[PDB]
Amino acid sequence: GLRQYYLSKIEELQLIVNDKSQNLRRLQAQRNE
Amino acid sequence: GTYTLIIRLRHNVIKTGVRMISLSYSRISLADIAQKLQLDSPEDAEFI
Amino acid sequence: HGLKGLNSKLLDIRSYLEKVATGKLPINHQIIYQLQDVFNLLPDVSLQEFVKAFYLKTNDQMVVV
Amino acid sequence: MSEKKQPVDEDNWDDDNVEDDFSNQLRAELEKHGYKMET
Amino acid sequence: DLYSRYKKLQQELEFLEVQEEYIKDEQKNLKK
Amino acid sequence: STQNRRALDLVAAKCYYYHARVYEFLDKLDVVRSFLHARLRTATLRHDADGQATLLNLLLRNYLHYSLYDQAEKLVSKSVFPEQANNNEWARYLYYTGRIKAIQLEYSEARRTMTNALRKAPQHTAVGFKQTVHKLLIVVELLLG
Amino acid sequence: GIISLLDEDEPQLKEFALHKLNAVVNDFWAEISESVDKIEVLYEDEGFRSRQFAALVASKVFYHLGAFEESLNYALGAGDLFNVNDNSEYVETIIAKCIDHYTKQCVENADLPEGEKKPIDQRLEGIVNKMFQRCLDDHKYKQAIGIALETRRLDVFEKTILESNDVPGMLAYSLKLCMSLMQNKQFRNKVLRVLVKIYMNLEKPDFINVCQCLIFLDDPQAVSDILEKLVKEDNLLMAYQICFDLYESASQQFLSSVIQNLRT
Amino acid sequence: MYEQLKGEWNRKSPNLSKCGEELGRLKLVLLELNFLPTTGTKLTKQQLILARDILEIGAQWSILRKDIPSFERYMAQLKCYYFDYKEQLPESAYMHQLLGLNLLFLLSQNRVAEFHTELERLPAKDIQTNVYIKHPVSLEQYLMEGSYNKVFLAKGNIPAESYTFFIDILLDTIRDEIAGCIEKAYEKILFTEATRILFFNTPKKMTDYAKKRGWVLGPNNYYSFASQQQKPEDTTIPSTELAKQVIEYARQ
């Protein structure tokens, strides 16, 4: 069962890669000025 | 749809009552307090 | 750093007291009264009166804060 | 958003300020003056 | 398409994490 | 990763307001309860945003609407943490959780979350439940202190 | 309604509560959130005809409880009833977490391959190879080599490129990924050696990437052997590109250490 | 099948072996017929009501032999049958009395939150009627008032079999509440007020006095020792973080 195990990891990773990246953007934005 | 509250607040009412007695009266008798407490149990006003 | 310095001084003087009380040091009279002269101060912080000293001020600083 | 069940349509310590609760409330002390003049 | 995408996602995840840990200490140094 | 799930979950919530209106136009909705239980189970595992809060709000409303145990069942329901509910579902969730805290003699831990729920979404004028929450609000305050 | 039918000590009703225990976990999962006593006592109960059978209900109730490990242990202990229940929407995440725990354990055992390795539950690895048997020849066997990498195993690693999916260039992008995402050399050379072995095993002898991985494997005696084989073939047209591959990539010390073997 | 339902259940109940026999006989009742969802099977709730009655009388025999770990079984199975997932027929004649017993059970073991969480089952069936609940509402919301003696004359009339098995725990609770209420600072009540006015027409109260607390007797007085805490002005350990309530919350 490849979809029921291995595919879910994608979403289980992807959300963090969204939100945390936004944080880093803010942080480097906070540095820039 | 909140039948319970009245049953569980009447104590709170007497709570306020005795709190008023804790502020107003200094030396009130055990049997001479309940006249302004209207529950009419001087036999139980001692441990009220 | 004040607490560290106080700890250092107290450790040195307990060392001195050890080597005079049980050790090869003279019991010469210079500090043997000055020590309890220091120990005579030791203010009784916890009494009935110091409550009104502490609490009456601390809440004022808290009000300002 | 609607979850409608509402029927069409200070004020915390001040209601019992003048309703009847003093000897001068509406009548001007006359409720006691029948038995106040004996002193 | 399959498999390798997950690995490259996770790769850029620790890469991004390196930048995140960096941004704090460089901010602390640049302020003073 | 198309995340249409949560938008369709809000669609489901909006039509399930009216479907719960249907379910009070008829008898209990235990089949719907099982369905939303399955929807919660497939939530929180793959996606969890704004659908879970709505479906648990429906769960609380159905459970309080019937006089059963219904409450400490929720107290052990440890899905207590849905995220930002765009200032709309969160307030009604706080209202339900404060009532279901008050139902077992809450001791002023519930009055603060009642006040928070009241002040958190007051923008609507006569929203539909504002009178009920305001009526229940100071019951506990006149009760306790 | 909340039901404490399991108060009695009668074993007949302990086994007869199976239907009840299965039926209640469909909508009332939060109802049963305190059965640490009854479930564990029943599982440790000796005279027990629902042994290896009632543990599935324990996994079901612990799944709602957030006990993703207790669910895993009872899923292992739920035997054939859990095995045949491999086609359901709920069991997907259960076996997914099972595989995740298994591959974390595999990384742990790969940390030290001798001593203090936890004995893998036979039903656990049975679940692992069974869900692999669900991922048999149905085309698109890239995950078949993938989970083979993360499980650190080699026989399944060989069988996946050996199974009847196809061998057009599977063995090429296998190399591309293995030196694309290599965590360390200690696993990279391990998979590289079985890769180069099966490269030699192919009917056409391997020519280019065998040498490319070989100098990434630091094996001058092997390249001396295969150039001797090409000498037995009595032409250099294979070794043509091999000499320039060594010039392009092989270290000078590697050449200086293989040259005396070349003339021996 | 449909045997000896009231075989020995009315005249008395000393046939404990028959109690065990009926409990073993119950296997044809519960697990030999649809009982968990009770969605179909229209013609079982009559004998399910009979099963309710068998459980009620069995647990009542168990409380006749005074067994609480079967009075949990009293309020375990039978509740969601008259109040089943499928409401089919009128419940019984006994049901409100049974709920009065269960309410008094929740009352008698100081579970006031668990007292409140099932008085709402009826909208208006016993909030104005049903003396089987009119006693428990006073029995609960009398312990919140500082009257503590008209409960026993209200115990003088009992709408059920005894209501005494809980009244023993009521006696217990009166004992330790009058203890814990007098044990603070007080000024030496005489023997008779602590002796007869509460309970125990001087059987053993002169001994119960030493049994509970002590407070050794002098010239016919029961003095309370002072026990006022000095308010020790240390406040360093519990209020050093309170003293630090700037730095370790405001980062500066």
DSSP codes joined into one string, F43-67: BTTTB-SSSHHHHHHHHHHHHHHS-
Nearest to G173, CA basis, from G202, G209, G218, G139: G209
Nearest to H71, CA basis, from H36, H109, H34, H33: H109
- Show which subunits contact E, needing at least 3 CB pairs below 8 angstroms: A, G
Residues paired with residue F47 on neighbouring β-strands, in sequence order = F43
Please report, for residues C21, H91, H189, H191, the alpha-carbon distance to residue H205 in angstroms, rounded to integers and kept in the order given.
Answer: 62, 48, 14, 9
Contact (CB<8Å) B9/F143: yes
CB atoms within 10 A of CB G67: 16
- Sign of torsion, CA H39 H42 H43 H45? positive
**Which residues on G lie below 8 Å from A6 (Cβ)?**
143, 146-147
Q: Which amino acid is at C31?
A: I
**Which residues on E lie below 8 Å from G181 (Cβ)?**
4, 7, 11
Contact (CB<8Å) H148/B47: yes
Per-residue DSSP letters for G112-172? -SSSS-----HHHHHHHHHHHHHTSSSS--HHHHHHHHHTT-SHHHHHHHHSSS--SSHHH
Q: Which amino acid is at F54?
A: T
d(C-alpha H5, C-alpha H50), whole Å? 8
Nearest to F6, CA basis, from F92, F61, F82, F79: F82
Q: Is E28 helix (H, G, I), strand (E, B) or coil?
A: helix
The phi and psi torsions of G148 (rounded to 5 degrees) equal -65, -40
A32 touches chain E (CB under 8 A): no
d(C-alpha G226, C-alpha H179), whole Å? 99
d(C-alpha G61, C-alpha G76), whole Å? 15
Q: CB-side exposure of H117: number of CA atoms within 13 Å?
A: 21
**Which residues on H lie below 8 Å from B10 (Cβ)?**
141, 144-145
Give the B:F interface size as CB pairs under 8 Å.
13
Q: What contacts G6, CB < 8 A, 6 or more positions away?
A: G13, G14, G17, G38, G42
**Which residues on A lie below 8 Å from E14 (Cβ)?**
none
**Which residues on G lie below 8 Å from H77 (Cβ)?**
3, 5
Nearest to F43, CA basis, from F63, F35, A17, F2: F35
Q: What contacts B30, CB < 8 A, 6 or more positions away?
A: B42, B45, B46
The two tokens of residue G228 are: 């001797």
The two tokens of residue G89 are: 């929407």
Q: Are F97 and F71 in contact (CB under 8 A)?
A: no
Residues paired with residue F43 on neighbouring β-strands, in sequence order = F47
The two tokens of residue F57 are: 């709000």
Q: Which amino acid is at H59?
A: A
CA dihedral H172, H174, H178, H179 (to 10 degrees): 10
| From H232, H233, H246, residue closest to C54, measured CB to CB | H233
The phi and psi torsions of G46 (rounded to 5 degrees) equal -80, -65
Tell me the resolution in Å: 4.3
d(C-alpha H92, C-alpha C41), whole Å? 84
Nearest to H87, CA basis, from F66, G124, G154: F66
The two tokens of residue C41 are: 């101060």
d(C-alpha H179, C-alpha H172), whole Å? 11
Helix axis angle, G89-111 relative to G68-76, nearest 10°? 90
Per-residue HEC secondary structure of chain H comes to CCCCCCCCCCCCCCCHHHHHHHHHHHHHCCCCCCCCCCCCCHHHHHHHHHHHHHHHHHHHHHHHCCCHHHHHHHCCCCHHHHCCCCCCCCCCCCHHHHHHHHHHHHHHCCCHHHHHCCCCCCCCCCCCCCHHHHHHHHHHCCCCCCCCCHHHHHCCCCCCCCCCHHHHHHHHHHHHHHHHHHCCCCCCCCHHHHHHHCCCCCCCHHHHHHHHCCCCCCCCCCCCCCCCCCCCCCCCCCCHHHHCCCCCCCCC
Give the A:G interface size as CB pairs under 8 Å.
24
F34 touches chain H (CB under 8 A): no
- Chains B+A touching (3+ CB pairs under 8 Å): no
G248-253 contacts, C-beta under 8 A, 24 or more apart: G249/G212, G249/G215, G250/G215, G251/G215
Contact (CB<8Å) B11/H127: no
Q: Are G17 and G57 in contact (CB under 8 A)?
A: no
> Can you tell me which residue has the tokens 């001791």?
F107
Chain breaks in chain D (C to N over 2.5 A) after: 9
Q: What contacts G218, CB < 8 A, 6 or more positions away?
A: G254
Per-residue DSSP letters for A1-29? --IIIIIHHHHHHHHHHHHHHHHHHHHHH
CB atoms within 10 A of CB A4: 20
What's the burial of F143, exposed, middle or buried (CB within 10 Å: 0-12/13-18/19+)? buried
The phi and psi torsions of F43 (rounded to 5 degrees) equal -80, 170
Q: Are H195 and H205 in contact (CB under 8 A)?
A: yes
